[PDB]
Design a protein around this ligand. Structure first.
Ligand code: 5ZX
Ligand code: ZN
Ligand code: ZN
Length: 231
C-alpha cells in the first residue's frame, strides 16, 4: 500500500515502485506547525537514476540517497527540481555534495535565489512558455503555465504512462487549497487544462503531496482551486 504521512517519521524516506524502472519517493516534514507528506520521482536512466525533486530538506534528502543506494543501487547522476519551494530544492546542496548534477528552469533558479532557498546548478532551456515540453533522459518535462507557482513543472514518463504533477496537482482526499501564497489562482485551471490536453494517456498521476490517482486528480484540483477562488 502507498505509505501515508503517519507511517513516515520526519527524517525517513520510503520508496514506492510504480512501474518497471519508476519509483516515487515519500518523505515528511513540518510546515506551519503540522507535518505533511511529500512525493518526488525516481526514473531509471540507462545505468543511472534521474531524480525528480528533493525529499524536502537536507536531512530527508540524505536519507533519500541512502535508501536509493540500499534498495536500487544505481547512481543518482541528475536531479530536476519542479519549482523553487523547499519540498523541491531543499536538499539540493546535499545532492550536489553527493555528486549529483542539479537542474531547474531559469525561472525556478531565479525564484529560489530571491527566496533564499537552495539553487540548482544548471538551467533547463526550452521551458520558458506555457505549453513548452523538452526531453530529459527518460522523461519529458512540461511547463503547463502558472498554477501552484509560476514556475511549476510537471514530468511525464512515457515508458510507463506516469504523470508526476508535483504541487500543481492535489490528492483526491484534499479538499481545501491551504496555503497558495505563490499561486496564480486565476491561471491554475487553464494550466491544468494544458496538462490534460498534452498527456491524455496518463495512467498513473502522482500529486506533489499524498496518494497517487489517475487523471481524475486534475479535475479534482481544478474544483478545489476555483472553490477557494469562489468564496
Ligand atoms: N511543502 C508543502 N507544500 C504544500 C503544497 O500545498 O504544495 C503543503 C501542504 C500540503 C498538504 C495539505 C493537506 C494535506 C496534505 C498535504 S506543505
Ligand atoms: Zn510549492
Ligand atoms: Zn508542495
Amino acid at each position: 500500500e502507498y505509505p501515508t504521512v503517519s507511517e513516515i517519521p520526519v527524517g525517513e524516506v520510503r520508496l514506492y515502485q510504480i512501474a518497471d524502472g519508476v519509483w516515487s519517493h515519500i518523505a515528511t516534514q513540518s510546515f506551519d506547525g503540522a507535518v505533511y507528506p511529500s512525493n518526488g520521482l525516481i526514473v531509471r536512466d540507462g545505468d543511472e537514476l534521474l531524480l525528480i525533486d528533493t525529499a524536502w530538506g537536507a536531512k530527508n534528502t540524505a536519507a533519500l540517497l541512502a535508501e536509493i543506494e540500499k534498495q536500487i543501487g544505481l547512481p543518482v547522476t541528475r536531479a530536476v527540481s519542479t519549482h523553487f519551494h523547499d519540498d523541491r530544492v531543499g536538499g539540493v546542496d546535499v545532492l550536489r555534495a553527493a555528486g549529483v548534477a542539479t537542474y531547474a528552469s531559469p525561472s525556478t533558479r531565479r525564484l529560489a535565489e530571491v527566496e533564499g532557498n537552495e539553487i540548482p546548478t544548471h538551467s533547463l532551456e526550452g521551458l520558458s512558455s506555457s505549453g513548452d515540453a523538452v526531453r530529459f533522459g527518460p522523461v519529458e518535462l512540461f511547463y503547463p503555465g502558472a498554477a501552484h507557482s509560476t514556475d511549476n513543472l510537471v514530468v511525464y514518463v512515457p515508458s510507463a504512462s506516469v504523470l508526476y504533477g508535483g504541487c500543481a496537482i492535489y490528492e483526491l482526499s484534499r479538499t481545501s487549497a491551504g496555503n497558495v501564497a505563490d499561486a496564480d489562482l486565476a491561471e491554475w485551471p487553464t494550466s491544468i487544462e494544458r496538462i490534460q490536453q498534452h498527456y491524455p494517456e496518463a495512467q498513473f498521476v502522482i500529486p506533489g503531496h499524498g496518494l497517487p490517482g489517475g487523471l481524475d486528480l486534475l479535475k479534482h484540483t481544478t474544483n478545489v482551486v476555483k472553490a477557494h477562488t469562489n468564496r
